[PDB]
Amino acid sequence: SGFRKMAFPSGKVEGCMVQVTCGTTTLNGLWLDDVVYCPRHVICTSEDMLNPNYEDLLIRKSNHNFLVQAGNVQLRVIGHSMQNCVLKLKVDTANPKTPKYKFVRIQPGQTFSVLACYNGSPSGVYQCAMRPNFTIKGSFLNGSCGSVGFNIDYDCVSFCYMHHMELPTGVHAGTDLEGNFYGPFVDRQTAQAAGTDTTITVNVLAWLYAAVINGDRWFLNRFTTTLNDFNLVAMKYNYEPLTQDHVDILGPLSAQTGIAVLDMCASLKELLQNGMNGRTILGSALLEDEFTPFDVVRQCSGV
Amino acid sequence: SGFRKMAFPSGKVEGCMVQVTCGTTTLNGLWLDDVVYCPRHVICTSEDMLNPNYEDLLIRKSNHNFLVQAGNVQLRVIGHSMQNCVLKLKVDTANPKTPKYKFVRIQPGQTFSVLACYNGSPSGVYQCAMRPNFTIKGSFLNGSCGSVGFNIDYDCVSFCYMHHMELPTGVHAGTDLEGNFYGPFVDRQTAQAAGTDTTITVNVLAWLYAAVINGDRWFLNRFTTTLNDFNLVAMKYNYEPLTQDHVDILGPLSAQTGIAVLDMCASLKELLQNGMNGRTILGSALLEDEFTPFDVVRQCSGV
Ligand SMILES: [Cl-]
Numbered sequence A, B: 001s002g003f004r005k006m007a008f009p010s011g012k013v014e015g016c017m018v019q020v021t022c023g024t025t026t027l028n029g030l031w032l033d034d035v036v037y038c039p040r041h042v043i044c045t046s047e048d049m050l051n052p053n054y055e056d057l058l059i060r061k062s063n064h065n066f067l068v069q070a071g072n073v074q075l076r077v078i079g080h081s082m083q084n085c086v087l088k089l090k091v092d093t094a095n096p097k098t099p100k101y102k103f104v105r106i107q108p109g110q111t112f113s114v115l116a117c118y119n120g121s122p123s124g125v126y127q128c129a130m131r132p133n134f135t136i137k138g139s140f141l142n143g144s145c146g147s148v149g150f151n152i153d154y155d156c157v158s159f160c161y162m163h164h165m166e167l168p169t170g171v172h173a174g175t176d177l178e179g180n181f182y183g184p185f186v187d188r189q190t191a192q193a194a195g196t197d198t199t200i201t202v203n204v205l206a207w208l209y210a211a212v213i214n215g216d217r218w219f220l221n222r223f224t225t226t227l228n229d230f231n232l233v234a235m236k237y238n239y240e241p242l243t244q245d246h247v248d249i250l251g252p253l254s255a256q257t258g259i260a261v262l263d264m265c266a267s268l269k270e271l272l273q274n275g276m277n278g279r280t281i282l283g284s285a286l287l288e289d290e291f292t293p294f295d296v297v298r299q300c301s302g303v
Helices: A054-059 A199-213 A225-234 A243-250 A250-257 A261-274 A294-303 B054-059 B199-215 B227-236 B244-249 B253-255 B260-272 B291-301
Strands: A017-022 A026-031 A035-039 A067-070 A073-075 A075-084 A085-091 A101-103 A111-118 A122-131 A148-153 A157-167 A173-174 B016-024 B025-032 B035-039 B068-071 B074-075 B079-083 B086-092 B101-105 B113-117 B122-127 B149-154 B156-166 B171-174
Touching: A017 A122, A026 A067, A035 A157, A054 A075, A054 B086, A122 A225, A199 A243, A199 A250, A199 A261, A199 A294, A225 A261, A225 B079, A243 A250, A243 A261, B016 B035, B016 B122, B025 B068, B035 B156, B054 B079, B113 B156, B199 B244, B199 B253, B199 B260, B199 B291, B227 B260, B244 B253, B244 B260, B253 B291
Parallel strands: A101 A157, B101 B156
Antiparallel strands: A017 A026, A017 A067, A026 A035, A035 A085, A067 A073, A075 A085, A111 A122, A111 A148, A148 A157, A157 A173, B016 B025, B016 B068, B025 B035, B035 B086, B068 B074, B079 B086, B113 B122, B113 B149, B149 B156, B156 B171
């Protein structure tokens, strides 16, 4: 009973978190095997970030300039290199707490858990969605860069995000663990803006199914619609177009509730045009779009 | 930047989670030193929970009836006893991953992180508040009993909650780690209802301060009020009366924003009587009351 935004257990990731310092700049690194991954702008001074030439800046750095601390123990840097927007610092010691892991570039509309860290020390965990405009809405202060986002299946940790920067709208941007940014963002302190923040339509429907499973059903009506009809309404409110693949993905939720996807679409169409009328769904007064269909099935089945 | 509901890193607690089985009933236990704590209704059959005599039921149980599994390794039970509504199973092995810990009975209006578990395996982490009616709004399925709530200061884990039961409204009830329920609830399958769900007024103000810190300030007005005046408005909407101790607790947030507590109270008074007018605060369309003043300061300062 109950439906909550719930992150993965962070124990496997806490053991990989270290501190990386270059001059006066300190952020977080990810220690897996004998490599520490961190944002490359650790090598920037405050004046460098206006228009940094990372190639030229990294040339005057040596291994001994990268201070890597795992708790109270200093690690010995024996190599360094740049891969896109991340630095890889080779250390002489493999992380004994390295879990089975992979690097994945997550798709927009998918979710992951963030372990927010400061000075190599975990601070807290929360869920984020990779929004269609390739930003996330998290909680990151100064020094939180290098905090990572991840998913867990069984016992393998899939790292998908590392935090780099914040945008004027208050949203956040970063890279995958290969150093490639999500979206068009670049790691310089220049005027950058996130595009239109479109809503993840399939996720809203999954969350409406979660509400029905949890006993909330005031928003169900006697109506149905079609994909083309609903998408005409989804366009005005900047919702993503719903596809048959989205319908099939919602199959498990439609089968458990007995509510056909297009019937649920008619409910969402009425919620978009008429509003909620001061009522709530799963304790929210707006439509939630950061729960994937997998998130709903996982939480409502207890995996 | 950004403000999110964020749980504590769960690594220290994951290492204490075990599975406890009695007959066909399986739930979670908390393994600290050589004792495993679990809800006492593990000894109940489905027919027992209607009106269980736990004393009489525990008499026909022996140590070898309690199956305790830590991962894939079975633990040897050498003693058992009842303390209020929890059982304490003594095992012949101390948990090598036992963190520094304490048992605390949390006050209503305070928050804690929940590690939801099934069959002794962590499933996810999320924040809950101990509501004034001594219920929490979490995410617990069958088999989730024995999952614990906790806080962390520096490196000491303060266990404050263990899950026992769910109420017809969809809310959740449990005990402290001494087995004493929060609120008037009893561990039997009888008609039980949560009382009036009053709002944690000091927490709403802390969350309004968090919004101001994060750039949201559309709800600020040119007005002020008094404690007695605001409390006349807090009564109609079932808000807790605000006290000078609440004002002092909000001191750090009032000082950082420069907005006097009573000025913020005038904003909340207008939000209660006029609503939000379709606008949002920190991405929410209603007033959040599950962030303590400490939660706001911690997240906005990066502890
Ligand atoms: Cl809301």
